């Protein structure tokens with residue numbers, strides 16, 4: 001029993017963190033096989049970031065300008081290429097600690113763990129959600145660029161995020177491991193609008209199921225609702241509209257608890273319209289949307 | 305910017321997790337050097353747990369009865385000894401992945417990361433606080449016993465907790481790495497009272513400083529208070545009384561932000577007496593007490 005914002009064990013990802021220095025700029029890199037992945041802005045100075053011409057900036061750089069340090073040992077760079085907003089530095093040595101991995105582009109609403117790094121050294125690990133507006137509410141300071149987001153299915157690490165930028169609003173923006181930004185963001189020191197964000201409805205419902213499993217039941221009621229009725233309330237409170245796909249993915253939790261999905265929606269409708277009335281659900285005084293239905297099942301069953 | 309409930313990177317601790325089986329009972333072990341540490345209740349069956357005579361139960365066991373599996377390889381047990389509520393199994397091989405480590409008994413109010421494990425396999429990592437009543441609000445299921453709590457200063461892992469028991473109230477109880485329980489708990493299937501818990505005042509104040517640093521300032525006011533006045537309010541709202549030692553440890557944050565400790569106490573007094581009025585602080589709709597002053601400084605500065 002109990003329910004926590006659980007991160008994946010960071011071990012397999014720690015063994016891939018390296019420091020990348022190009023000129024005066026230092027950030028984090030991801031060493032998988034004989035390739036080091038890092039944000040392309042490693043080739044910039046603070047001055048260049050206003051409107052960098054990355055093609056031109058990269059042209060003035062050679063393999064020997066990219067200093068890659070794995071803990072304390074130097075890696076020999078034999079190739080360099082820019083793919084979208086990432087630099088791929090071919091090294092002469094394959095990382096002996098490379099785990100089984102995939103590069104995946106996660107969907108908005110999906111969660112992942114972040115291993116925050118500075119100078120190729122890990123500082124901490126936390127569990128995040130990719131917001132519906134493609135930003136993340138991380139904890140990142142200067143030098144955190146290159147820190148990655150990931151998920152782990154048994155021995156396979158699926159890399160999904162690489163940290164690039166902090167928007168002037170304090171939220172974070174980054175790319176998949178092919179350098180494609182999540183959202184409309186560009187790697188430039190300019191004010192960039194993150195779209196209107198919404199609450200991930202399916203995740204809140206999953207977290208309401210986790211609360212039922214762990215004892216918190218005060219929010220349960222004698223009501224039911226329809227997808228149409230629930231969606232009118234979801235619209236009013238800036239919640240993602242619930243679809244049959246979300247209901248279908250909530251199947252396992254509905255079956256384990258015996259609480260129909262639309263009955264749980266009715267509880268969420270009352271919590272939305274009336275608040276928590278000074279009460280808490282799983283230690284939180286608000287509706288938590290950073291646990292997917294899969295995260296709840298994994299944590300409640302003990303999937304290692 | 306941003307502020308998250310950050311766990312330490314779990315890598316150094318993952319390399320020490322083993323599975324321990326004695327008869328029909330399987331739990332987690334901690335392999336450091338040539339010793340495997342696990343909860344002594346590994347020698348019990350469900351039936352024995354009502355009032356186990358561990359001395360007698362251990363007497364019926366030999367080195368060959370303790371099956372220790374590190375991932376997939378078997379460890380040869382050459383010795384066994386009970387120290388308080390832990391079993392120390394001497395193995396013939398030193399763990400090649402043993403990091404620099406210490407065994408420390410943490411104080412109530414201090415925080416640590418937990419690497420939740422099942423069958424010697426890690427499932428996740430979360431950041432916890434040792435409650436003032438010596439319980440932890442973890443996420444642990446059957447088989448999680450043996451999962452450890454720890455802190456990391458550069459390359460040294462300080463082990464502070466080992467999971468043993470879930471109280472009938474859903475909270476968790478365990479020992480330091482010498483087998484001494486935190487709190488009045490005994491490793492027996494009996495209803496055991498966890499004392500009246502309080503909120504860790506110094507940690508809430510540290511988290512109020514973290515909010516100021518990260519932009520959340522709405523709670524700041526034109527008021528100040530005294531330690532005496534603040535403590536009358538702390539008493540009324542079940543908060544640990546604030547002492548000069550707590551004020552002294554808040555020094556760094558007070559100096560970085562320019563907000564005197566007693567001024568921040570005055571903000572906490574108004575939040576206690578008036579609530580949050582439908583507002584949030586660092587994404588939380590309640591007063592967070594699971595970040596110590598040191599955790600806030602570490603996260604805000606980027607200590608790896």
Ligand SMILES: O=C(Nc1cccnc1)N(CCC1CCCCC1)c1cccc(Cl)c1
Nearest residue numbers: 044045046140141142164165166187188189
């Ligand atoms: O956001 C950034 N950093 C940051 C700070 C806090 C948290 N998360 C990240 N940067 C700064 C990167 C530059 C620093 C000076 C040397 C050249 C690299 C940034 C600025 C604009 C666009 C991009 Cl893509 C990145």
Ligand SMILES: O=C(Nc1cccnc1)N(CCC1CCCCC1)c1cccc(Cl)c1
Nearest residue numbers: 348349350444445446468469470491492493
């Ligand atoms: O709390 C326990 N487990 C648990 C479950 C969920 C979360 N955290 C832990 N146990 C169960 C251990 C017994 C299970 C059957 C075989 C013999 C070992 C326990 C029961 C009484 C006292 C003690 Cl010390 C431990």
